[PDB]
Amino acid sequence: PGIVELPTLEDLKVQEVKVSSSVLKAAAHHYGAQCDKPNKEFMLCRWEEKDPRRCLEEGKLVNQCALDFFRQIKRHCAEPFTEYWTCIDYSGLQLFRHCRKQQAKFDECVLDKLGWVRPDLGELSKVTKVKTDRPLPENPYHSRARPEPNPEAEGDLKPAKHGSRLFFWTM
Amino acid sequence: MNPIIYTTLIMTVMSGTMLVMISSHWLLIWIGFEMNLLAMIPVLMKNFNPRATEAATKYFLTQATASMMLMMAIIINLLYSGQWTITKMFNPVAMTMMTMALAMKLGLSPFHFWVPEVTQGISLQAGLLLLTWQKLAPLSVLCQISQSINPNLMLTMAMLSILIGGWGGLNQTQLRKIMAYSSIAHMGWMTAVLPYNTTMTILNLLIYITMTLAMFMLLIHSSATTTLSLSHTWNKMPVITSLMMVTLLSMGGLPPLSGFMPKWMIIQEMTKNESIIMPTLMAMTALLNLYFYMRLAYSSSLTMFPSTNNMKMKWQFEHTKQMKLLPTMIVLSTLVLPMTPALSSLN
Amino acid sequence: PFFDVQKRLGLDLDRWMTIQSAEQPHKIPGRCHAFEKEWIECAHGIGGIRAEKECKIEFDDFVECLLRQKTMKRLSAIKRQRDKLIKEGKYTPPPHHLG
Amino acid sequence: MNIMLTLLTNVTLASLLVLIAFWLPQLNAYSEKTSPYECGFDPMGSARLPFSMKFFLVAITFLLFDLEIALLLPLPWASQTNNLKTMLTMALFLLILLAASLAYEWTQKGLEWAE
Amino acid sequence: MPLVYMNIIMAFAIALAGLLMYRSHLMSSLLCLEGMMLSLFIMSTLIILNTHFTLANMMPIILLVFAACEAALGLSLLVMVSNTYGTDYVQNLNLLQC
Amino acid sequence: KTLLHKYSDIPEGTECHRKAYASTSIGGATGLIVSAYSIALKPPASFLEGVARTGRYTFTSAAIGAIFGLTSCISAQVREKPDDPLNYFIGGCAGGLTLGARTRSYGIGAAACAYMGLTAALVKMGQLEGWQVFAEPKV
Amino acid sequence: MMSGRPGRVPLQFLPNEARSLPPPKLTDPRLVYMGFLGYCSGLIDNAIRRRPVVSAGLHRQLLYVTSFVFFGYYLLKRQDYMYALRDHDMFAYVKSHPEDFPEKDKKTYGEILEEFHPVR
Amino acid sequence: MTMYIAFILSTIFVIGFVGFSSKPSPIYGGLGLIVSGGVGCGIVLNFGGSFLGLMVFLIYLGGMLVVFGYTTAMATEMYPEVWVSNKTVFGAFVSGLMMEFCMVYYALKEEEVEIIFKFNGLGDWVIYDTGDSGFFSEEAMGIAALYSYGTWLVIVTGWSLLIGVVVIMEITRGN
Ligand SMILES: CCCCCCCCCCCCCCCCCC(=O)OC[C@H](COP(=O)(O)OCCN)OC(=O)CCCCCCCCCCCCCCCCC
Ligand SMILES: CCCCCCCCCCCCCCCCCC(=O)OC[C@H](COP(=O)(O)OCCN)OC(=O)CCCCCCCCCCCCCCCCC
């Protein structure tokens, strides 16, 4: 009953980040607060537009905005990145608790090299207001027209005409 | 059994039935049925006679099977609709599935085979509870889901209920078996009108409640379980046999007695629903109940059966029971026909 | 229910769980939250008789959402014709089929 | 993949370990050798009789007790709920009723099972 | 509907038949009864897990803890029958008759 | 009710063999149902006489079903009156007589003649007029 | 059937808007019959307990009449409510559905051709 | 193979059910039932129902059926009624191995099996849903709601269990 419209593979050939999981996790805190604006725009689209195909343009933007976050640290102290994500990779659960010294060394550069700051606890979990230009969807669920409710009761109650009206009972 | 334990056991049985009538969730409906079952068996076990053990075992096997079979009707409806709300369900096989599942609890179709035997084994007071209170819970579900029922399937189950329930009643000596066969016959009358209009399905319920409380507590007051034992009660207390014959006539449905009010309204409804052959046949089978009703009435008070010289002690002493609510029970169960238009209150 | 005490005194006993689009732990969804929400709001204040036919579209869509009968039949017919064709060597699956 | 593979390996290990414990010892059983041992004397024909109620009574109490504890496995995740007060009250209820069932069962003889 | 759902549904139906088609051991009958609920417990888990009815993960335990309660009643009646009669036969469990 | 639909599809007093086949199928199925019940409630002590019991019940019910099949159809064929209720009445009595033959008693056959013939008229009465036994909920 | 009408608050024996109806008059013939039922219970109440029926425990059957009358009275108001309610939304429906209730034509018996059957 | 692994577990579930439903010896029926009890857990495990799957092992395999063995040890009909003892049980066991073998072949060929319901014989894996559960196990969060939203069920389930122990001793007390 229609077409499941799918985007062509052309727009899907977007640059994808090629890094192991521990690389993301090691720099996750220093990535979330510093690339929030496109991230919030994309994920606002995901929950508002409610359709995957609508947020394709933003989908490549966050991936792109990940790459220019993953490039200056190469033109800066990529060496403290190496052992830090290596040590995190050694952990089975990628626990930060064991590898804190390399975290400090990693944090020391970005405080001065790019001048970033480590986000505090709860800061990343804060709900943030994202400023966008796209209009809000009208019917994200594509709802149809709604059946009209049956008319309500109205008018004052009057005594039953001629009583119960059940066989010979007068009242 | 300790009275405090007995009171609690009845309290849960009442609450379990109350739970069924007040639950909008199918799982909770099942919860009420099972925990009502969970406390029904010990009450039947109060006397603890080998006949009772046979009766309780029979009662549990059929009720547990029906309740377990009820789960699939919920599960299948869940599977095809994902709705736990007790409403018009969405599967003919599931609708069919529960209809016999609930019918076995009520005992209308051949399912009814447990109803007589369990009553025979267990005590008179327990039979009163089983045949009156334990019929509200299965009826409560049917009233709510009446809009989804297949008319042919339910009308049939009602038909064999009055048909067989009345037919075998002619061949019962023990009063307990007579009452159960009457119960199965009365089960058909309410169930027949159930798909059409639920209002007088209830009206039949409270009315049918009234005689069965009236009859059983009269029988308990008589302390008699057989026809011959009932016959001797004329010598001790002729008055009680007089009221019992009024209720026996009333429960038979002769006007202007109360028992005519349900049947009259039942015939009126399906006549409005263009079903006119169906009411006629049930009315014809209604006389079948009246026959052994008359036979008991003939043995009880209309005639005067021989007594035993040992009855003379019974004259000297007196009854210690309080038969609570018996006075208002029979009066409300024999002359309420003039107050028929009050059924709109049920609506 | 037969006696809707829940409505009278307004204590929620079971209806929190009767349908899957209600409040859920950690606000995580069911499989067909989108569909059943549409069907529910379609069939509110309407009545069982009218909602059976008027909101039919929202129903079978929602039923198909959780049963997934015709979708599975669609895949079955796709797969059935595939093996009825590739076994004859008429079309060869591309590399992305096999990785 | 590995789970039933681990289950599979143990069962074969057990079966072969009894297999080489069964065919290897060169079974040479006779009639008196296979006869039941009853303290060195004649068996009178038994092990087919009911055993009162105490063994059954404790089994049912254990079964009922096992069912309530089944209701309270999810407590470790229950503590992670948002509304602890309702969870604290409710979990306490199951335990005190578990106590009450034990309390009644104790008071009305019960655990002092029949002899 | 997926092939597996037949396997539980047919499992119940054949379990249902064994519960009704009797023999001489109502002990064996109780086995079909608790097997009957096991399929009910098993199948209920499939839909609820499949459809992500998170709050409905409730009832597989709830159905278990109540179906298990009937075992307490049923097995207790078993020994009661096996005390006034000694055995668990069903043909002899007909003292009611009339 | 496809099996029952077979009888209704064939016009009255036309293709008598089809009507007889449809009628005897109704009787055979009905005899099977009651025979299976009788085996259930009443134990057929030995299996072989159990097949004898269901054989008798099915053979009887088929005979009434078959005989009513011809007598109803041929009478309508002979008298060229399909709407006439008497067509079923003679067939109904004819079926009742066959029951008497199977039980070997004139009294039961005579009783079955009157009752079944009356009902056979009544069901035809309903088919012509439009009587419904299991009426759908109308009001 | 009124099982799900809009506004029915559950477990409400006498809804408030039912007060807009003429209350049953204190000697309504239906009400006194309800009082009859209370008395008729009283006479037999002494009968089972083997007491001097009519003149036996004036307090006992006196309470019976009182209880039956009040429980009767509230029942009658509730009974009058549904019949008034049943007729009310009835009338509101037919005005809302004129097409399903045609006004049958006005023809006198003069033009009506009613065939006549002699008794002979 | 692993294509239709859940097809397998469902199959032993059926034959395990046919085992005890064929009314064999109550211990042997218990053996057949626990076999079905064991295999059924794997079906739930394959769907992610680890907590539900492990419970039936705990309170149904190691739970109910253990006390079932007591009554079997209490009943002890004078001779074992193992499969060789009777011929109807063989017929019941043999029969119950046919129709489910028939309809799987019916379902494996054209998949249009219409017994009672319409049913697809497609691979078990299809009906699975794709989507991450994050860090919260959906099964665990559902059950833990016992003490958050399942307040009403907790009272009724607890109260019935309390009534469960009062009845059991009362019926077994033998007056
Ligand atoms: C719808 C049709 C009819 C349906 C009901 C029919 C019922 C009877 C049918 C026949 C029954 C079987 C045959 C007869 C059985 C008799 C049973 C019996 O016990 O009889 C003997 C018994 C002896 O009497 P006893 O109990 O001693 O009481 C005497 C009064 N104190 O007698 C009795 O116990 C009977 C006691 C009767 C007491 C009557 C009291 C009447 C009081 C009237 C008050 C009027 C007030 C008017 C006020 C006017 C102003 C407002
Ligand atoms: C227009 C379409 C149809 C055209 C064909 C005509 C209708 C179908 C054929 C006729 C069916 C009704 C006639 C009776 C058939 C069953 C007869 C039967 O069961 O006989 C066996 C037995 C009677 O003998 P018994 O009392 O057992 O004595 C010997 C004991 N050794 O039985 C018994 O003991 C039990 C009592 C008899 C069985 C119960 C009643 C069966 C009939 C119910 C109505 C069936 C209506 C079928 C047609 C409408 C529905 C499709």
PDB file of C-alpha atoms and ligand atoms in Angstrom, chain B residues 234 237-243 245-246 249 255-257 297 300-304 334-335, chain G residues 39 43 46-47 50-55, ligand 1:
ATOM      1  CA  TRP B 234     -43.685 -32.471  59.007  1.00  0.00           C
ATOM      2  CA  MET B 237     -42.009 -28.598  62.551  1.00  0.00           C
ATOM      3  CA  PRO B 238     -44.910 -28.569  60.076  1.00  0.00           C
ATOM      4  CA  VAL B 239     -44.535 -24.823  59.523  1.00  0.00           C
ATOM      5  CA  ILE B 240     -41.077 -25.097  57.938  1.00  0.00           C
ATOM      6  CA  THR B 241     -42.357 -27.668  55.446  1.00  0.00           C
ATOM      7  CA  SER B 242     -45.084 -25.147  54.602  1.00  0.00           C
ATOM      8  CA  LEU B 243     -42.628 -22.389  53.673  1.00  0.00           C
ATOM      9  CA  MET B 245     -43.402 -25.830  49.568  1.00  0.00           C
ATOM     10  CA  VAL B 246     -43.989 -22.124  48.878  1.00  0.00           C
ATOM     11  CA  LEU B 249     -43.529 -23.731  44.009  1.00  0.00           C
ATOM     12  CA  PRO B 255     -47.094 -17.110  39.018  1.00  0.00           C
ATOM     13  CA  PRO B 256     -47.498 -14.864  40.927  1.00  0.00           C
ATOM     14  CA  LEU B 257     -44.568 -16.272  42.883  1.00  0.00           C
ATOM     15  CA  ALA B 297     -43.585 -30.893  47.791  1.00  0.00           C
ATOM     16  CA  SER B 300     -42.795 -32.698  52.381  1.00  0.00           C
ATOM     17  CA  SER B 301     -46.044 -30.977  53.306  1.00  0.00           C
ATOM     18  CA  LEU B 302     -48.837 -31.548  50.774  1.00  0.00           C
ATOM     19  CA  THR B 303     -49.149 -35.110  52.048  1.00  0.00           C
ATOM     20  CA  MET B 304     -48.210 -36.459  55.486  1.00  0.00           C
ATOM     21  CA  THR B 334     -41.660 -15.740  46.980  1.00  0.00           C
ATOM     22  CA  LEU B 335     -43.616 -12.471  46.556  1.00  0.00           C
TER      23      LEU B 335
ATOM     24  CA  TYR G  39     -44.238  -6.963  57.716  1.00  0.00           C
ATOM     25  CA  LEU G  43     -44.947 -12.701  60.966  1.00  0.00           C
ATOM     26  CA  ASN G  46     -41.793 -15.577  64.855  1.00  0.00           C
ATOM     27  CA  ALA G  47     -43.120 -18.676  63.068  1.00  0.00           C
ATOM     28  CA  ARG G  50     -42.113 -20.712  67.335  1.00  0.00           C
ATOM     29  CA  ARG G  51     -43.376 -17.467  68.863  1.00  0.00           C
ATOM     30  CA  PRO G  52     -46.947 -16.102  69.044  1.00  0.00           C
ATOM     31  CA  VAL G  53     -46.677 -14.871  65.419  1.00  0.00           C
ATOM     32  CA  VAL G  54     -48.708 -11.661  65.297  1.00  0.00           C
ATOM     33  CA  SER G  55     -48.313 -10.715  68.974  1.00  0.00           C
TER      34      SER G  55
HETATM   35  C1  LIG I   1     -49.875 -17.619  46.871  1.00  0.00           C
HETATM   36  C2  LIG I   1     -50.665 -18.841  47.271  1.00  0.00           C
HETATM   37  C3  LIG I   1     -50.414 -19.283  48.688  1.00  0.00           C
HETATM   38  C4  LIG I   1     -48.973 -19.628  48.961  1.00  0.00           C
HETATM   39  C5  LIG I   1     -48.687 -20.037  50.385  1.00  0.00           C
HETATM   40  C6  LIG I   1     -49.437 -21.261  50.846  1.00  0.00           C
HETATM   41  C7  LIG I   1     -48.996 -21.788  52.189  1.00  0.00           C
HETATM   42  C8  LIG I   1     -49.796 -22.964  52.700  1.00  0.00           C
HETATM   43  C9  LIG I   1     -49.987 -24.073  51.699  1.00  0.00           C
HETATM   44  C10 LIG I   1     -50.232 -25.429  52.312  1.00  0.00           C
HETATM   45  C11 LIG I   1     -49.074 -25.938  53.132  1.00  0.00           C
HETATM   46  C12 LIG I   1     -49.166 -27.395  53.518  1.00  0.00           C
HETATM   47  C13 LIG I   1     -50.388 -27.759  54.321  1.00  0.00           C
HETATM   48  C14 LIG I   1     -50.519 -27.018  55.628  1.00  0.00           C
HETATM   49  C15 LIG I   1     -49.271 -27.022  56.474  1.00  0.00           C
HETATM   50  C16 LIG I   1     -49.436 -26.390  57.844  1.00  0.00           C
HETATM   51  C17 LIG I   1     -48.125 -26.170  58.528  1.00  0.00           C
HETATM   52  C18 LIG I   1     -48.244 -26.026  60.018  1.00  0.00           C
HETATM   53  O1  LIG I   1     -47.310 -25.918  60.769  1.00  0.00           O
HETATM   54  O2  LIG I   1     -49.512 -26.109  60.412  1.00  0.00           O
HETATM   55  C19 LIG I   1     -49.770 -26.169  61.833  1.00  0.00           C
HETATM   56  C20 LIG I   1     -49.439 -24.843  62.482  1.00  0.00           C
HETATM   57  C21 LIG I   1     -49.999 -24.701  63.880  1.00  0.00           C
HETATM   58  O3  LIG I   1     -50.017 -23.302  64.269  1.00  0.00           O
HETATM   59  P1  LIG I   1     -48.857 -22.720  65.216  1.00  0.00           P
HETATM   60  O4  LIG I   1     -47.527 -22.951  64.555  1.00  0.00           O
HETATM   61  O5  LIG I   1     -49.101 -23.230  66.610  1.00  0.00           O
HETATM   62  O6  LIG I   1     -49.167 -21.145  65.192  1.00  0.00           O
HETATM   63  C22 LIG I   1     -50.517 -20.689  65.482  1.00  0.00           C
HETATM   64  C23 LIG I   1     -50.565 -19.185  65.477  1.00  0.00           C
HETATM   65  N1  LIG I   1     -49.747 -18.619  66.549  1.00  0.00           N
HETATM   66  O7  LIG I   1     -49.849 -23.724  61.648  1.00  0.00           O
HETATM   67  C24 LIG I   1     -48.961 -22.735  61.456  1.00  0.00           C
HETATM   68  O8  LIG I   1     -47.841 -22.790  61.887  1.00  0.00           O
HETATM   69  C25 LIG I   1     -49.516 -21.566  60.697  1.00  0.00           C
HETATM   70  C26 LIG I   1     -49.445 -20.278  61.459  1.00  0.00           C
HETATM   71  C27 LIG I   1     -50.113 -19.135  60.717  1.00  0.00           C
HETATM   72  C28 LIG I   1     -50.130 -17.822  61.455  1.00  0.00           C
HETATM   73  C29 LIG I   1     -50.920 -16.752  60.744  1.00  0.00           C
HETATM   74  C30 LIG I   1     -50.902 -15.397  61.402  1.00  0.00           C
HETATM   75  C31 LIG I   1     -51.720 -14.371  60.661  1.00  0.00           C
HETATM   76  C32 LIG I   1     -51.639 -12.968  61.206  1.00  0.00           C
HETATM   77  C33 LIG I   1     -52.475 -11.983  60.431  1.00  0.00           C
HETATM   78  C34 LIG I   1     -52.378 -10.551  60.894  1.00  0.00           C
HETATM   79  C35 LIG I   1     -53.290  -9.619  60.138  1.00  0.00           C
HETATM   80  C36 LIG I   1     -53.196  -8.168  60.537  1.00  0.00           C
HETATM   81  C37 LIG I   1     -54.206  -7.287  59.842  1.00  0.00           C
HETATM   82  C38 LIG I   1     -54.090  -5.817  60.156  1.00  0.00           C
HETATM   83  C39 LIG I   1     -55.161  -4.970  59.513  1.00  0.00           C
HETATM   84  C40 LIG I   1     -55.000  -3.487  59.719  1.00  0.00           C
HETATM   85  C41 LIG I   1     -53.736  -2.931  59.109  1.00  0.00           C
END
